[PDB]
Write a protein that binds this ligand. Structure first.
Ligand SMILES: Cc1cc2nc3c(=O)[nH]c(=O)nc-3n(C[C@H](O)[C@H](O)[C@H](O)COP(=O)(O)O)c2cc1C
Ligand SMILES: O=C(O)CCC(=O)C(=O)O
Ligand code: F3S
Length: 1491
């Protein structure tokens, strides 16, 4: 979406501002989407003041007196088209208006031109009228809008696509519709009426994830226009709804508040709910600014900018206890008709740029280019940094800046005094060291009974306590889903973590930890509407993990505490179900008796579980009491603490909090740590072979630190900062839980496959009871064991495949390893139901044809040896299929076809490979673009047939790629332009992609540089992918990859491998269905991966809607992988997943073997087609009617699954045209096409001549220069061009100006630019300066946006002005001089040189591992703004450093004329001492940092 506002402070209200708003909307068209007719819009709208001059004509025609402005209520209403229905609706509106004691003056038919609408919107269009209203008692202004708000809320009980009030106010009105931006004013005649005047406008252009427009869903809403995505919505809704029955404020009756009723509803969009909640806050006595501060609070902790504003910190300190953030990316633009303003989310994940004139005229929007004001009278160009706001007081004619706004709200009450007196904090650095139990026999028995398994303590708890981090592992989750397993599992294992992809970004829990918090508040939640001292009475925790000391301190504390047992007797009468019934009833009664904290314990009275008792699993207990308290209207009366033996992993703590726990005492987990440390084997080891750097207090501290780190990780996967927001929210998908159970304890969680009843979960806990009543059982779970859990991959299976394939049987032995499998994946429950007789094999399409659909897929050159990586590429190219350069870039030597193969199959070009032939090429057909951008060079991008944007992989979907430092050889460091020994943890998000429109921008950038390459987007299966994928299709992607939770990895957290991501069957099927239903299916080819091994797997994936098939782990096995599962270790025995030269030499593996593998699978596909009676894969894709449930399958834990999710797909027997795709989608006409068509430019490219051209630019001119870069790179590579092209531009540049710039290209821009300037720049020069007529001091003003130089591998940028956040984010070799920046300057920088001649925001140098930066700090507060994890700050001492800085500023002055640079150079000696130099420990001994 695009959004913004314009305000005329000092001039008379006019039509010009309205025209400007419509033009601004037009400049934001690329930020919105269109319906299936490619004509109707997802939404465009404007909010303005009431057009009094226009409405006067209506009063005149009627000979009616017109009331004063603050006395005339106007309702803009969408009504039914059908006349009889329209009159029932009208009568209802009038009826409620009368009930508010208001008078209906009449109705105005709104003049429209329906013939400009797209066909779907035209079909959809409501009948649009305005109701005119007054108060005969004389109410006006605030009170009138209050009564209209009440009226709106009552009328809104009958919401329909057909019956909706857009606005009802005496100050504001909204004109909106399902239109493209330039259509809005052609549809509403009022908007082009010169009599329409307004002192402000809020405009919005919508991007939706569907193709079926509904008019009420355009924006603005009543108060707010919203760009972003709420990532905690289910939680935010649940908490707010729980407030509804108890609402109380001065100035309001109980009955009026009751009329507002459902403030929030999960049926409605995030935007609708936010508008509603925010208006409730406004209309009960806050400004919209204060409302937004409470609902979407700043990350106020560790904010140096708040040093002189203690009251602002106090405000948030207070509200932190009352209201969790409605988190996720957001630019909010809103108006009262009194104030108009804007604010960002805590992380500033949407852009907001603004402009102020000499007359205090102000323009703010998603992009800077957007209103043409005389450049000469602009007095400031600014932006909103994270959490910031800006506003206008219309009556006062005043612009209000960030901290002025917040201080005024904060000073209303003595928030801090209240906290001082009322709040209790519980925290303890010490643990209890005395053991709970004395017999290790007791400890072991309790462990067994509560579900601890040998690997649980050995592979999970012990590493957490001994290392202080959760464990890393490798390869995929090879095992049956918990519901399909014959092994006992925990209720936790049925819940998969949800995560962010495309529609909102993950955040970085390490680099941007400063923005996150695990703090929690215990006790009753106060009145949100009426601030009082009482509401600060709480117990604050710094962490949800409460140790024995902290638990006792809580039990004492100032709040009423009650213990509630989760145990019950096994008396042959009690069941888990009535124990649950009793639990819930007890909890309610206990809360009714005044308990403010409930401790749900499986150790009541401090007594141990016996053989005569069982327990309610803590996740079941907490979920049940959480939801039943909600149902009882008691949820805000108390907090829940889980005191449980069944909690030890990172995933456990997250599930517990996600479903209602404020805090957890994991008493058996702590006891497990104690007993491990106090084990003579451990004590004896420490005397030599384990780190005895660990006394008991350190082991315990390490354990807790591991859990806390793991919680930050899980939150960040979804982009969530505060545990308080995660607490209500239910950021999971359940797999294998029945509807009845889900409704009882996990209401609102999707669980698409049915499954477990309450009785089934009890049966499962009883398996562990029977094991408990010498050592814990080791099940198969992490690594294959002879009698353990089944793994799809194992060494023996692997060895028979490799020998079958090297032979030219071994394959039949391999084939039966697979068929003897227990049920493992969802597809295992299905079988074929043919609708046609079998045909003969000779009729079926050839193996050569089928193999074209196969992809090997992106395994990085760091994770794999070049031997294993290149071998795959040669094999896929021989096949006419595709391989993928995962996220480590690619060696340029591979771009060329092999010429020099001898008769033994060896090539001097790639001498480490074997079994080659002269036609061969190791070029990866698919080139990957991942968040780290390591590969990412113009030549690299031109070498791809296809380009893949990797949003997530199945093994670790919330997170970035991971390459252990030991595997970063000099070779890898060269490819990646990073530092040899250094661990690469890639950013979780693309800093390029914080929304669907930002993804559309990256796809545009890729189509720009390489218009012939298809662009794919790699997603991971989870509920919500369908919606996401519809967006991706609207964003002009050519392909969508769906990856299963299943897939391999060279290194990932073990928790992520086991707990995050869903089956591909669910993903492929959901995406296929959603695309077909939106009529978007023809727009994209669908590819699938995750545990694909076999022709049968391929046929199953085909039936579910996949057209292409990816293979990772299995392809590695074909090359000799023996499933050692030490990939993350660098010790691969077989030279596949290692960089060690001497292990690489062991690599046997020839392209011919993997060729043979794929022919085997394709032959299997042919036998299956013949059986089904079809000639071709093309005939069966999406034919889910050929699937049936297998009758020979009986599940261990439950009766059956529900598989409608897989079977109920749209009919595809007859309608198959969606299989026909356009070769590659176009960007449409682009300025670079005109540049490239110019004969002088063609001459400069082809003859390497000098050329210069000059052009006017506007914000809709995106990615300029980039198509020319691609053309040069295609011909000359990155460094071959000897020509010289200078392009001069004037105006406001759109997104991605100078992306992928190369040597020989000079881009000059006079004006300003939007985000991503020089994205992936490789060479040349970009120079950005203000207009000559600009009067402001350039160094004090924004000229460039966010994420500039992202992943740059070379080049120089000179900008005479300030940048936004993440300047030089992941810079590898770019150089730049700028005059100031927002937050996170140089964030993942590994090289190059950055000079900032002005103030910078906080979090400087987070993850900066190489390169140098120089910061001019004339204030003296820079040391407070550094991220101290890696870089050191020092004054310039080395003469080489001084000369490097001086040369760059001298260049900056020559290019720019920078007045600031000139002043520095004129007084060099005075300014030198005010610079700080940022030095990572790779640069400590460089001459420019040392000596
Ligand atoms: C060794 C290894 C390294 C991988 N590295 C990447 C990476 O560079 N980028 C990426 O998108 N996926 C990466 N993945 C995931 C694969 O692209 C693919 O999605 C996965 O292997 C498919 O599942 P499968 O192994 O069961 O066939 C890697 C997988 C493994 C096996
Ligand atoms: O090589 C990289 O940087 C990422 C690869 C990765 O995370 C994986 O092996 O799954
Ligand atoms: S599992 Fe990994 S360590 Fe080697 S043998 Fe296979 S690549």
């Amino acid at each position: 979406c695009g959004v913004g506002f314009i305000a005329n402070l000092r001039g008379k209200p006019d039509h010009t501002l309205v025209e400007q708003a419509l033009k601004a909307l037009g400049c934001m068209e690329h930020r919105g989407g269109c319906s299936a007719d490619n004509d109707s819009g997802d939404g465009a709208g404007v909010m303005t003041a009431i057009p009094r001059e226009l409405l006067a004509q209506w009063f005149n025609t009627r000979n009616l007196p017109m009331p004063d402005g603050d006395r005339l209520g106007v309702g803009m209403v969408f009504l039914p088209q059908e006349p009889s229905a329209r009159e029932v609706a009208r009568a209802y509106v009038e009826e409620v208006v009368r009930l508010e004691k208001l008078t209906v003056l009449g109705w105005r038919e709104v003049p429209v031109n329906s013939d400009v609408l797209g066909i779907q919107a035209k079909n959809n269009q409501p009948h649009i009228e305005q109701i005119l209203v007054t108060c005969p008692e004389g109410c006006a202004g605030d009170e009138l809008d209050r009564r209209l708000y009440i009226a709106r809320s009552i009328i809104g009980k009958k919401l329909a696509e057909d019956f909706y009030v857009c606005s009802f106010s005496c100050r504001t009105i909204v004109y909106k519709g399902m239109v493209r931006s330039i259509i809005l004013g052609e549809f509403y005649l009022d908007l082009k009426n010169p009599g329409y005047t307004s002192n402000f406008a809020v405009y919005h252009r919508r991007f939706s994830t569907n193709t079926m427009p509904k008019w009420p869903l355009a924006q603005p809403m009543r108060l707010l226009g919203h760009n972003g995505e709420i990532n905690t919505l289910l939680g935010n809704i649940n908490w707010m709804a729980a407030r509804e029955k108890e609402l109380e404020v001065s100035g309001w009756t109980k009955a009026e508040l009751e009329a507002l009723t459902p403030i929030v509803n999960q049926a409605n969009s995030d935007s609708y709910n936010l508008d509603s909640a925010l208006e409730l806050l406004v209309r009960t006595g806050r400004s919209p600014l204060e409302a937004a501060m409470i609902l979407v609070p700043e990350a106020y902790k560790n904010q140096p900018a708040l040093k002189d504003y203690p009251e602002i910190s106090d405000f948030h300190d207070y509200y932190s206890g009352l209201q969790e953030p409605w988190d996720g990316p957001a630019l909010l633009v809103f108006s009262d008709g009194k104030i108009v303003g804007a604010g960002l989310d805590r992380n500033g994940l949407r852009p907001a740029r603004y402009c102020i004139t000499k007359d205090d005229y102000i323009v703010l929007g998603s992009e800077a280019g957007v209103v043409d004001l005389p450049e000469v009278d602009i007095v400031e160009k600014g932006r909103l940094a994270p959490g910031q706001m800006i506003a206008v007081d219309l009556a006062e004619q005043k612009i209000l800046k960030n901290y002025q706004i917040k201080q005024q709200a904060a000073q209303k009450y003595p928030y801090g005094e209240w906290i001082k007196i009322q709040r209790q904090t519980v925290a303890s650095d010490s643990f209890a060291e005395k053991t709970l139990f004395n017999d290790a026999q007791t400890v072991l028995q309790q462990q067994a009974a509560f579900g601890y398994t040998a690997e649980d303590v050995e592979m999970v708890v012990v590493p957490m306590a001994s290392q202080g981090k959760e464990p890393t592992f490798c390869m995929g989750d090879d095992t049956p889903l918990a519901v399909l397993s014959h092994k006992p599992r925990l209720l936790y294992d049925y819940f998969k973590q949800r995560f962010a992809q495309v529609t909102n970004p993950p955040i970085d829990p390490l680099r941007e930890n400063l923005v996150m918090s695990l703090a929690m508040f215990l006790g009753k939640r106060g009145n949100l509407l009426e601030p009082k001292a009482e509401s600060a009475r709480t117990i604050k925790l710094r962490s949800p993990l409460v140790n024995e000391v902290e638990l006792q301190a809580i039990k004492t504390g100032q709040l009423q505490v009650a213990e509630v047992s989760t145990l019950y007797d096994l008396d042959g009468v009690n069941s888990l179900e009535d124990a649950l019934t009793n639990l819930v009833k007890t909890a309610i009664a206990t809360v009714q008796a005044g308990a403010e904290i409930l401790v749900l314990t499986d150790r009541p009275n401090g007594a141990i579980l016996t053989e005569n008792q069982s327990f309610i699993p803590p996740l079941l207990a907490v979920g049940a009491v959480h939801h039943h308290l909600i149902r009882a209207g008691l949820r805000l009366k108390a907090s829940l603490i889980v005191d449980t033996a069944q909690c030890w992993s990172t995933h456990h703590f997250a599930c517990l909090v996600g479903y209602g726990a404020s805090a957890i005492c994991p008493y058996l987990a702590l006891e497990s740590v104690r007993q491990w440390w106090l084990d003579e084997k451990t004590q004896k080891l420490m005397e030599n072979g384990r780190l005895d750097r660990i006394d008991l207090p350190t082991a315990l501290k390490n354990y807790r630190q591991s859990v806390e780190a793991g919680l930050f990780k899980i939150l960040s996967k979804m982009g969530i900062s505060l545990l308080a927001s995660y607490h209500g929210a239910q950021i999971f998908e359940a797999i294998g839980l029945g509807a009845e159970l889900v409704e009882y304890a996990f209401a609102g969680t999707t669980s698409r496959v049915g499954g477990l009843t309450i009785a089934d979960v009890a049966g499962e806990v009883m398996v562990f009871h029977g094991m408990a009543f010498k050592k814990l059982e080791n099940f198969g779970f992490v690594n294959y064991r002879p009698g353990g859990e089944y793994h799809m991959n194992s060494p023996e299976m692997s060895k028979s495949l490799h020998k079958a394939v090297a032979a030219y049987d071994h394959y039949e032995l391999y084939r039966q390893y697979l068929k003897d499998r227990p049920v493992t994946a969802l597809r295992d429950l299905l079988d074929f139901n043919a609708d046609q007789p079998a045909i003969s094999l000779e009729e079926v399409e050839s193996v050569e044809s089928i193999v074209k659909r196969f992809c090997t897929g992106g395994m990085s050159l760091g994770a794999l040896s070049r031997e294993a990586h290149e071998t795959l590429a040669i094999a896929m190219n021989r096949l006419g299929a595709k391989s993928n350069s995962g996220e480590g870039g690619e060696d340029v030597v591979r771009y060329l076809t092999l010429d020099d193969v001898d008769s033994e199959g060896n090539s001097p070009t790639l001498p480490h490979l074997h079994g080659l032939q002269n036609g061969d090429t190791a070029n990866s057909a698919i080139k990957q673009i991942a968040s780290g951008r390591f590969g990412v060079t113009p030549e690299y991008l031109m070498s791809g047939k296809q380009l893949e944007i990797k949003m997530a992989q199945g093994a670790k979907p919330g997170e970035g790629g991971q390459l252990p430092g030991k595997k970063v050889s000099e070779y890898i460091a060269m490819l990646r332009r990073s530092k040899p020994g250094v661990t690469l943890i890639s950013p979780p998000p693309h800093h390029d992609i914080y929304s669907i429109e930002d993804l559309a921008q990256l796809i545009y950038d890729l189509h720009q540089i390489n218009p012939e390459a298809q662009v794919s987007v790699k997603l991971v299966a989870e509920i919500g992918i369908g919606t996401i994928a519809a967006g991706v299709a609207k964003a002009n992607a050519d392909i969508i990859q769906i990856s299963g939770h299943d897939g391999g990895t060279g290194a990932s957290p073990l928790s992520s491998i086991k707990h995050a991501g869903s089956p591909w069957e669910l993903g492929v099927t959901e995406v296929h269905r959603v695309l077909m239903e939106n009529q978007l299916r023809d727009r994209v080819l669908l590819r699938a991966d995750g545990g694909l091994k076999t022709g049968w797997d391929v046929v199953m994936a085909a039936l579910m809607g996949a057209e292409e098939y990816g293979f990772g782990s299995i392809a590695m096995i074909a090359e000799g992988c023996i499933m050692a599962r030490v990939c993350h270790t660098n010790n691969c025995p077989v030279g596949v997943a290692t960089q060690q030269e001497r292990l690489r030499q062991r690599f046997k593996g020839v392209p011919g073997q993997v060729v043979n593998f794929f022919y085997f699978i394709a032959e299997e596909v042919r036998s299956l087609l013949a059986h089904l009676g079809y000639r071709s894969l093309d005939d069966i894709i999406g034919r889910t009617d050929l699937l049936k449930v297998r009758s020979d399958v009986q599940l261990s834990k439950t009766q059956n699954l529900t598989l409608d999710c897989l079977l109920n797909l749209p009919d595809t027997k007859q309608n198959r045209q969606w299989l026909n795709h356009e070769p590659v989608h176009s960007n449409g006409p682009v300025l670079d096409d005109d540049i490239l068509a110019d004969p002088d430019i063609q001459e400069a490219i082809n003859h390497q001549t000098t050329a210069t051209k000059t052009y006017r630019l506007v914000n809709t001119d995106r990615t300029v220069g980039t198509r020319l870069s691609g053309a040069i790179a295609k011909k000359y590579g990155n460094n071959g061009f000897e020509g010289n092209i200078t392009l001069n531009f004037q105006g406001a540049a759109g997104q991605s100006f100078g992306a992928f710039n190369l040597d020989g290209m000079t881009l000059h821009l006079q004006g300003e630019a939007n985000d991503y300037v020089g994205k992936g720049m490789n060479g040349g020069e970009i120079v950005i300066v203000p207009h000559p007529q600009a009067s402001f001091a350039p160094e004090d003003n924004v000229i460039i946006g966010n994420t500039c130089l992202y992943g740059a591998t070379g080049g120089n940028l000179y900008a005479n002005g300030r940048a936004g956040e993440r300047f030089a984010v992941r810079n590898s070799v770019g150089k730049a001089v700028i005059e100031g920046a927002g937050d996170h300057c140089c964030e993942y920088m590994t090289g190059g040189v950055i000079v900032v001649l002005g103030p910078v925001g906080r979090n400087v140098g987070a993850g900066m591992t190489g390169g140098l930066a120089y910061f001019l700090d004339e204030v003296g507060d820079l040391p407070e703004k550094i991220n101290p994890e890696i870089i050191t700050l020092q004054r310039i001492t080395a003469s080489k450093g001084e000369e490097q800085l001086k040369s760059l500023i001298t260049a900056h002055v020559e290019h720019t004329g920078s007045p600031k640079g000139k002043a520095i150079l004129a007084n060099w000696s005075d300014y030198l001492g005010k610079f700080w130099q940022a030095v990572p420990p790779s640069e400590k001994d460089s001459p420019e940092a040392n000596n």
